Paper text:
Synaptic vesicle glycoprotein 2A (SV2A) represents a novel antiepileptic targeted by the prescribed levetiracetam (LEV, Keppra®) and brivaracetam (BRV, BRIVIACT®).
2D classification revealed that SV2A protein existed in both monomeric and dimeric states, in the absence of any ligand (apo). However, we could not reconstruct the monomeric map due to relatively weak signals; instead, we determined the dimeric structure at 3.5 Å resolution (dubbed as SV2AApo), with C1 symmetry. Intriguingly, no obvious opening is available on either the cytosol or the lumen side of SV2AApo TMD, indicating an occluded state captured for the SV2AApo structure. Roughly related by a two-fold pseudosymmetry, the two protomers of the dimeric SV2AApo are superimposed with a Cα root mean square deviation (RMSD) of 0.9 Å. However, they are not identical, in particular the TMDs, which show significant variation. For one protomer, the typical MFS-fold 12-transmembrane helices were built into the EM density of higher resolution, referred to as the canonical form (C-form). In contrast, only 11 TMs could be modeled for the other protomer, due to the lack of TM12 density. We defined the configuration of this unusual protomer as a non-canonical variant (NC-form). The dimeric interface was mainly formed between TMs 8 and 10, with additional contribution from TM9 of the NC-form protomer.
Author numbering:
A (entry chain B): 133 to 404, 415 to 709
B (entry chain C): 133 to 404, 415 to 734
Write the structure that this text describes.
Amino acid sequence: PGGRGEAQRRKEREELAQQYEAILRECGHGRFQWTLYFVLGLALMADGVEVFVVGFVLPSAEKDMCLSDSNKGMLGLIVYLGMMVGAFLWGGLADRLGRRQCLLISLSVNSVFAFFSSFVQGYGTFLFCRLLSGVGIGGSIPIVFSYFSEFLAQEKRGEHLSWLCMFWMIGGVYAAAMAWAIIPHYGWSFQMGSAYQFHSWRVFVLVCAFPSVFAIGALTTQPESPRFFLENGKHDEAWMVLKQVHDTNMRAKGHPERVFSVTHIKTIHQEDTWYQRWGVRALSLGGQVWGNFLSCFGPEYRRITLMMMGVWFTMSFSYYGLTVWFPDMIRHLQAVDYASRTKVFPGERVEHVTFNFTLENQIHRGGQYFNDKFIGLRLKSVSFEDSLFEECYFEDVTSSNTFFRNCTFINTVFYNTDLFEYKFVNSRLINSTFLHNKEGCPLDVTGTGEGAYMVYFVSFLGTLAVLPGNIVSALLMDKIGRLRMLAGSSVMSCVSCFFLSFGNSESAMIALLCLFGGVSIASWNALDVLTVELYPSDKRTTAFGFLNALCKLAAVLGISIFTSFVG
Amino acid sequence: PGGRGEAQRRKEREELAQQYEAILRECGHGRFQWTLYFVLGLALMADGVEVFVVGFVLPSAEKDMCLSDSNKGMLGLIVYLGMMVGAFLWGGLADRLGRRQCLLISLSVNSVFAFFSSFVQGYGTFLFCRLLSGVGIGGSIPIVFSYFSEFLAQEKRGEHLSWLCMFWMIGGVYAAAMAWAIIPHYGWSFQMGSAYQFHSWRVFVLVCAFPSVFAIGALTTQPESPRFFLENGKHDEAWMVLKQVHDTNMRAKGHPERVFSVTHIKTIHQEDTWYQRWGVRALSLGGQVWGNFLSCFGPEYRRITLMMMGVWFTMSFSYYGLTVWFPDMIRHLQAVDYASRTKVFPGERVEHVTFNFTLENQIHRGGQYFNDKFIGLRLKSVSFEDSLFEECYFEDVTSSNTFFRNCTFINTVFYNTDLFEYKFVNSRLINSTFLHNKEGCPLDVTGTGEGAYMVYFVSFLGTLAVLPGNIVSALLMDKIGRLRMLAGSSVMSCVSCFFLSFGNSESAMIALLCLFGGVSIASWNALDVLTVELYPSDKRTTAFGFLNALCKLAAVLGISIFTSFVGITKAAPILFASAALALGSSLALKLP
């Protein structure tokens, strides 16, 4: 009777899909689909902000706490682990919790946790709270695509479902713009009663998590998804959901909702201790999720599932590329760009002369002063090494970005300077008198901020230029159909000649990565939209959960093996 | 009655339009259509070269034939006003005198005055030569679009009119290639005339006129648009041009002899003193154009023209960014980089060693020189201030970009210099007098030649890189739904505002403007195709030229804004453009 029961269930699912599609067609206009797409764009941009921050801003924002390289570099992989664990668990639980409730709690749990993280201290506390943010955010993509694909009709599924890349990219660009803006400017941190001179990235995390509360406020009015109610077999709630979504067309032009209600009731008739209790229903939910995973792994969907597993594995290369790989190349390019401006000062002092010209970006090697005396000299990016000064009574010498290594001074007095005894490392404290001097601070991220904002701008412009490469590619894989291969080959050949001829600069790499990012993101949307079409809605949310989980595992393991493969 | 007569006339117009498109679909597609495509692509190459020389090669005004800066700003504006006048007048003429006649006259005038501009010397003469060249070139785009639309039907109109952006952009590519290859390297610019000097600037201007004269040479063979021949009653010529295009198409596909009689039957329905002559011609043509313009605002086409002006206003803010905003920002960034890059030395003092070395970018303040016999001195972009020199005279020394102030020369005399009293002001001098020089008409040879080389090479690479991105975007625009090309254009305008408000670095600007300009130039022609389709042939070129002229009006007033108040007002036009695009939300989609 097992085979007959399975065949009967398959027939039930087929007739349920047909009926669903019937309600989809009887709805009428798809402007409510536009509304849902715009609303869920906020969740998309929140996920984009999260992936942007973890890919780019996290390694450098930690310098206020001076974590080790094996701490800050690996922190990205811990946060990726957090989001993939969230993906596993909550994609699995999406088919049972309630997609609207699940999405709302997913947004809120990361939003409030980032709200708390933006002010707290602690070396491992930041890692823990970013794990919390990642486990909150990693489930956004599967939930959002399932939730939006339920509402959208079968015919208009392709275009209006694959146009979701726009909000993700706008979120990435907006997060990049905030990173460029807030990080270098210290006017946003004005406060009273708080002596902590923390860097602006504490405010940056808050302002980048703000789109999460945007999304929460957007979704607090949207109703629940009806097809989940149909899967549960519930009748009345899906009836109000469909009546509400049909009220949009009722306002538009007016439709016979009573007749549609008759079809809805017809298909309803066709489709017939607190702590202890937490574990009591948790074990049942986990067992049902395990059974769902075993069923989706069965002979019905084994070949297809493994086929995509291979497809994402060969596609995940572009994913970790565009998320984390080229950052090293672009930071190296920015470093060699910055190296062309700095200069070495071997000592330009002259006998019995007064020096007052402003000087910046100095690294000293052998620049000793022979009984010199200067007043009002401006020094920026101070780096003294084997450049001892004798009888240099400096007054009103405003200075910033002061760091020392292997240096000494004799009868040297500094006033109104940023010099501090904490920064003195591997040097002898000779004549290190800073009485009545301006209060110095440890450098921490101060020596990286100049490289921080400019790389934020280069990332911002890269993600901005990905969008024009996204539009044409999305139309390419939206409209052409079966023969997209010739257009794709033309695109790659043209962009190859593009950077080949255009390689007589340093923006050639920027253009190359922008074009490749556009192509890869369009392909990602194409894979998402085709996977939506293939899997049935009964097990689709858990599907996407496992798919995103495997994608993130592959993305992590890429760099995890590259760091020990080539170096 | 009048209403009955007008209704009958409109019905006859529609029936003849249907017969015309049926006869066009008789002809088919073949070698003739693409040969005409290349012939008109020569004209669009000329138009693109003219636009490049207007926009990217503004700085040559201050580099050759030095004049006051008050007269230097008109170079980028008077030519645009000339393009206004040309679009207006020559669209109005092309709808009455014939597109081929007016296009030929446009390209003839452009070629003649572009050739004139190179050899002339005076600044006013150059200004009028360039103004006339702009007037001649302004009649290219609308007249060529109409003249090439009257040879195609709806079967392949969209693609084969979209592919003109390739030629429009390759014109700028070729112009930039000349700018980079000729302007910096004086070797190619032959100094054959001992009594006739030759700057690379005039040679570059002269050689940029090759596409115009080549369009003239290769376009006189192409016959006129048969639609005008049908309109004015010249039926035999229409029949023979249709026969010729038919014969050309059959050799590629289909037997020719069968359709001859069918085409003849299809086309046989329509058959059968200087002062005084010029006065009569003016009286007829001006009255006809005035009547056409007043009828274009009538109820038959009032709403469509009113929406189309706004739709074009949406386009003008991207044309601006591609054409005039990018070169100005590149030049200003290079200027501030040059200002940042300075070298200060107390003095080049060496012991008994000849100073025969090439050095540049010398700016010395408060430098005292030890007296010695100076030999081999060379001055290139060298300036002095607060410095004194004693016994430092040299014979036959080259000078360039030399400006001296608040510095005195003691017993120092230089020869073969390009210095005048208007540069050396507010300073003392003892036993110093510069003679045996080339004083006269200022000629800044190699003036910022290294800076000019970078600018021209960057413009060349930006255009050459836009070219394949333009290929891709033009190919992919066809797949877009023809009702949503307008929305795509609006999206590209919005991202144009994004780039323009978020562009502040050299390589950043180059990459972002190239990647944008690909798709933007691809999406520009959507408005052209839209205006071609919904404007009737008797009203096509007049209205199209009017709308193009309003586009040039928006561009020239943006230029006026940047010439009157810029620096603090970098982002004000961006906000204005964003608001203008947002305002036309419904009009950009409402297509009757």
